Amino acid sequence: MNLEVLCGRINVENGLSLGEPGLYDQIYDRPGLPDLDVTVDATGVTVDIGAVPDSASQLGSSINAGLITIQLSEAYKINHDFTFSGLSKTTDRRLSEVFPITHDGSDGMTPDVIHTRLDGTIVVVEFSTTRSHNIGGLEAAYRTKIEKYRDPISRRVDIMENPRVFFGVIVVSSGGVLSNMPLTQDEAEELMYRFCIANEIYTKARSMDADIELQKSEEELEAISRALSFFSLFEPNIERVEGTFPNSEIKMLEQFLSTPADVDFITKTLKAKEVEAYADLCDSHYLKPEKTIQERLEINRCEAIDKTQDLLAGLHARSNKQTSLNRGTVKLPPWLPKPSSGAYGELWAKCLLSHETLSPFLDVEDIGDFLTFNNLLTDSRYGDESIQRAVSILLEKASAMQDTELTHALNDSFKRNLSSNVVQWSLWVSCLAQELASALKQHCRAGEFIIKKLKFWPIYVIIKPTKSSSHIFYSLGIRKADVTRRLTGRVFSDTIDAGEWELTEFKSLKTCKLTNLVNLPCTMLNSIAFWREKLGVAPWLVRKPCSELREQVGLTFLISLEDKSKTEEIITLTRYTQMEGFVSPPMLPKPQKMLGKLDGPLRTKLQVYLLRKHLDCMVRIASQPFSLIPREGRVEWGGTFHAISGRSTNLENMVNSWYIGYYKNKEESTELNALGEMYKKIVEMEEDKPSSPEFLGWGDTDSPKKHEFSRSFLRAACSSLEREIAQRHGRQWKQNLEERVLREIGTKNILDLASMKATSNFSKDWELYSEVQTKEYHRSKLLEKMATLIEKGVMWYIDAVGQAWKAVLDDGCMRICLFKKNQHGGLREIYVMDANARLVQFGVETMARCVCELSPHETVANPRLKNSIIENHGLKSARSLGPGSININSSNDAKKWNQGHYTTKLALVLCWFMPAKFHRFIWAAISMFRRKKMMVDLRFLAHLSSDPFREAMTDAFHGNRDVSWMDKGRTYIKTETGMMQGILHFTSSLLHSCVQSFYKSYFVSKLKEGYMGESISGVVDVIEGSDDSAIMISIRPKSDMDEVRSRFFVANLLHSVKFLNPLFGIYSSEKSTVNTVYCVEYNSEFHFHRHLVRPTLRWIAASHQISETEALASRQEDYSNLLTQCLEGGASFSLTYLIQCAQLLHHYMLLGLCLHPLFGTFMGMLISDPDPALGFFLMDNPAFAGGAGFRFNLWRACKTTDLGRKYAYHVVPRVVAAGVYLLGGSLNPNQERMLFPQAQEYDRVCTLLEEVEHLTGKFVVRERNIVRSRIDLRSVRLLGAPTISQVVRMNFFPGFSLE
């Protein structure tokens, strides 16, 4: 290459400059590494490098073949020298000659390249290297190299007249190249290729002489010698293991490594599991004898009608067959007063002074119209009364730091959503649910009634708590003359009448549904402000509800008031029904596969409505797909529609329709229904153990039997990943690995163990039920298990293991406990281990995380990749195919990941990537999992002692019918199979990559031989994390009629994955689209060829969590962090502000806005002093509304107002009761620099935003495609079309240009 043209790319204007850091990743495919013969002698290093095999990529021409030498004086820096040989115009020009001398000590320092231009501009070029695989080091070395010369260069140039100097740095590794100097990609790829062969030789010769590494650390050396003496003196009694834990025999491992793989048995099976597939495509897609594409969609249409009628019938046969019912979906009455400031009649007067399932035909027409015409969004009159005036006061004060026109234009829109009536209704509910939750735990005198009058409103309550503290009974009454308006619907509860009063019927409410009634008024203002932007209206206009909006704010109001699972489930299951329809011609959409998961017993008048609307979406899709329209160079899809209420919309409007019931929680709800379910999902495949340990690691099979695998494959899918590691990194990857592990286990201290981690107090004592009762459990933390350890003289982690392994072998189990939150799907179960077992399991993680971290696909240890595989597939395919090449991908799933994996094959698949000293250890840390014992709640055991699977448990108890997973009398549940969730998180993801690299090498060898004997041309990519995956195949067909035969051929390859999986022990699911064209979907982000769609509504709903923190002003660093999550999810700068004002209303309502009798004081107090840590809410700036964090806002208020001078020196109750109980006139630029470190940078921002303070713009349309793009200032990524003045102008509202 050349070094002068490269310097001729950069242009500096005046003063000093650095540029912008840019990263090039390894994208293009390199060739094989050349033969290396290295011989170190007394004279020096003798090197022999052969001739690299040729590539069509044309890399490796730079390195020249032959024999050379390096002097032993310069062997310690071979890596820095061999790589940059060409750019090494070694002239050794000092800085004292070309620059002034100001006595800064840098005069002697000589950069590696100095280039002087004719005009006078100078470029300062550097060169560096790194050996780490973490992209933190690639930035660390760059930043320290910057600091190496930042100060003296400035000190010298400030004296200079007519100044122009640039600092240019390069950092190269085999991971990625980070540079601030523009290059072509190829010129970074060759740098990486050369670094490979440099480091390989440095390692090879490093072994012979110890003085070469004339460095390292005096302390680091101690750690390696500390953690090397353990793995040679540790000794677990083998013959005592094989007797205790059922299937652990050290002979099985010594036969896995040594015996080779049976190739005469592999090539036969792949030929029988193939013709299975091709004889199943033609049977279920109607390909024989021959039929036009128009006739086949007519056979498919009539098969989808049969299956749905046999489902509706069987659900009718067992049901109290009726066609009428008087009920209400909203158990609360419709009332709407004006905020101010028959034994039931006598009962009120006194204190004043089933189990059957409905039928799928029920005449649900009440609900069918409340969605079209409803009185929910008509502005009620009294938008100026007590409660709304008390909020207008606390919004002006916080918004005084800015006073521009954007603010008065966005605070007069929010004050228009707070006045509609669906919010004015929701404010007197969410105040009632703060009384019921308050007096939930209180005193009971048999026959007690408590009376309470709601403030702000003329409504009365009557509580009556029971001893269960899991129920409560109320009833409300009003004067019948104050009820002015009502909410105009027939889905409501019917109120008893009195001549002068109106009452209700003493209903009852649980106590898990009270965190959901308090977050009501805040999740409405977010659902009005999200669906008025997607449709097209603007915040500063007025309109009429366009009747595509009544249904979405109407439907959200119903699912969130009937709080049940199994009704928020027939919606989220509409995602795999509609996602079929993107499927390509040689196949047909088949959404009938979702029957099953759709046969449950209905129990309301809503789940009947959502079920009939869902089936007619299955019939319409099965009859025609979403059609393709390739107008521009881009592609578009036509015919999309909403699911529930048939409509027509675009993509983003559909993709967000899924995710209508999502919401998160962490409260660990307890109810006998929920807990009884978890134990059902744990013991499912326990009675299906094969009971003949010959196919669990000893031999081969063809037809596995639901827990088994074939060993001859696990050797052929491990040794196919090992090649792909040996080429990206250099050969001899093993020793270097051994170093990383040892230093990592050695230096781990006992003073830094993750505390606050819960553990389990389960032992022999808690084993018989009768004798242990009325005796609470109360599991404890981990901080106290570090106590008794330091009290015996142990400060290094690797010394507390030896006592922790014997404390298990003398017991015989794991002693686990259980814990479960309530959020309707996600990660709802948590498995807690005792303390003697977290120590033996900490070791097998650092041993197994350092091997994932050097793999190309796997995306859970190296997070950077998730993005860079699917975007960099276009370019890599274009280069070796030439434009005009199609894309045919898929996206998969696994059904039972845990509960389905034997715990061998996770110990055999790891012991292959290990250096033969640890084999005795890990094979003994695993095989601790083949006998477990899990607790069962006590309240669960009580009710059971005195229909499906519950009549089996109480049967297994009491000494009746024998079962294997439980025992008689004892309080626990045995098990002998399967990993658990979150315990073996990292070794199990390593077994996924050993598989996916078996396909990527199986498909590639199949494309190489065509069907007639030709050869297709293609490019195969694979990516996969813990459970998901994807595959992407691109081809280039020469002529027509070969585009038709080469697309039928691929369709099988992606289809036959379903049959080849059970040979490794993985079971494919029925939620895995197959053979889509131009669209893929990896984790939750859908890539529609050129448009990236990301579901926003998921992050808007999970934006106001009950803040469980002690000191105020530590809440606001959460609140202001659940905000930058949404903005990166794709949301305007004008909406992200209207989501902020809703956090405010939530905040002050926790300090007691409508619960406490004295709030004028705490309201009149904060107006005088506005500091946080007393309870003031610092608001953002209208534009740039979620970019800069909390600091920026604390600093933009630190230099304007009173804060300056002062700075010159249940769950709902205890969040409130801790809340209200705790209640020179400037700064010199030297102390501010101490406090706010970048206070010199913020002003580069604060001066730009004061240019756009006025509301003026137009309407445009541009580029119709979106792309993730990185912004730097803190770093935040904003979704936008392909600076700060440009982003702030485009992202204020879609289709609008500010200023």
Ligand SMILES: [Mg+2]
């Ligand atoms: Mg998936």
